Amino acid sequence: MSYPYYIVDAFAEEVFKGNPAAVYVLEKWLPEAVMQNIAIENNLSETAFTVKEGQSYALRWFTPEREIDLCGHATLATAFVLFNYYSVAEETLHFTSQSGPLAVTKKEEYYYLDFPYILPERIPILPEYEAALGTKIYEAYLGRDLFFVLKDEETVAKITPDFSALKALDLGVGVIVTASGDSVDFVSRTFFPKLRINEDPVCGSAHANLIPYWGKRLNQTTLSAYQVSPRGGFLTCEVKENRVIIGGTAKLFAKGEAYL
């Protein structure tokens, strides 16, 4: 009847920032329906459910709509609560998702996720792109999402896109916007109107395109980043051969118990 849960703001130093997710560490699996209903109920970005299976932790993510293939901030969140509340001694957690094995590594107050090294390829700068964004796009690229480079951090932060216009664009799943950071290496913001989510405060998977791009362009192995969403979010980045690493802090917003 009682199921402990945690609400954590991933990639946040303090509450109300970063990207929020609810994580449920269960002793056994709940029915698919119940887990879906819980996600609808708390209406948060994503609700992660995990159960220790051997030495790995089986992960499962759900949004208010249905189960997704993967979500980074929610993985970091699940890691955060296992590391801080379920006494895991090892510096690395191993998960067994539907998208294959995942690993998060704790180093001090940071949690590290790994993503594929995917440099986005040049794309034509359509004027309908600059229209939806409401600003000038200096460079354009494509990967899983459209990838536009803007003037500066001030411009990235300030823009307010026509989300209905962006949903209409043909290419990509989402839209990424970047620029040279004022106090950090690079900043970004990610929009996913095609997926109901107008703006993700911090999509880590987007850094598969972000990190490669800025590492090559800035000529560095390590970069500091900040997804300048309203909520904000810091990310420490590293370039490896065929893989990128993002590390971020986390903050517990709430802890409690759900009753079923």
- What domains, with CATH codes, occur in the chain? 1-116+249-260 (3.10.310.10), 117-248 (3.10.310.10)
CA distance 73 to 95: 14
CA distance 96 to 246: 20
CA distance 65 to 48: 14
CA distances from 113 to 25, 50, 61, 89, 203 (A): 19, 17, 16, 18, 12
Could you tell me how many residues make up the chain? 260
The closest alpha carbon to 83, from 117, 106, 60, belongs to 106
- Tell me the helices (H) and strands (E) count for the chain, helix number first: 6, 18
Q: Catalytic residue among 41, 46, 90, 121, which?
A: 46
Phi, psi of 175 (to 5 degrees): -140, 130
Report residue 150 as tokens: 């803007």
Give the amino acid at 135: T
75 Cβ neighbours under 8 A, 6+ residues apart:
48, 59, 61, 95, 102, 104, 113
For tokens 């229209």, name the residue: 131
Q: Is 46 a catalytic residue?
A: yes
Q: What is the DSSP string of 103-170?
A: EEEEETTEEEEEE---PPEE----HHHHHHHTS--SEEEESSSEEEE-S-HHHHHH----HHHHHH-S
The closest alpha carbon to 158, from 207, 232, 229, 234, belongs to 229
